[PDB]
Amino acid sequence: MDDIYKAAVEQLTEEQKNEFKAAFDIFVLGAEDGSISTKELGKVMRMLGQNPTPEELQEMIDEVDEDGSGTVDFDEFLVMMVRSMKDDSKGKFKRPTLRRVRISADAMMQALLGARAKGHHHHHH
């Protein structure tokens, strides 16, 4: 649980955080615990056209699930937003090439919110 990102979460205004909060629920949409797990993570991942396996999804979850809970709650997910928000291009490794390869937060959230902010009508199945 990075403290710098922790502050980032608190930094997000009520409105900005609200939008991010919506994305959080989307990942766990239908989650009994409400925590974003590999299963709750892949669901949204598929929404963006991603088809990551649960076993591999665990790595993505761990990205923000430093607690080893296996699930990224609101705070854990919110960190993800700040993780790529303040991270222009830095990682523990992930080899060379677009040092980021992070779930396109831009469109990612757009899919969860179904286009919340004018523009396209929404989405089409």
Ligand X SMILES: O=C(O)CCCCCCNS(=O)(=O)c1cccc2c(Cl)cccc12
For Ca ion, the binding residues (CB under 5 A) are 65, 67, 69, 71
**Residue 36, beta-bridge partner list:** 72
Q: How many CA atoms lie within 13 A of 14 on its CB side?
A: 0
Residue 20 or 83 with smaller CB distance to ligand X = 83
Among 26, 78, 82, 103, binds ligand X (CB under 6 A): 103
Residue 71 or 84 with smaller CB distance to Ca ion = 71
Rule CB under 6 A: is residue 70 a binding residue for ligand X? no
| C-alpha distance from residue 29 to each of 10, 24, 26, 36, 37 (Å) | 23, 8, 4, 9, 11
Per CB under 6 A, contacts with ligand X among 46-65 are 50, 52, 57, 60, 63-64
Instruction: Tell me whether residue 67 is annotated as binding.
Output: yes
Instruction: Decide: 27 and 46 in contact? Cβ < 8 Å.
Output: no
Instruction: Tell me whether residue 97 is annotated as binding.
Output: no
Give the annotated binding-site residues for Ca(2+): 65, 67, 69, 71, 76
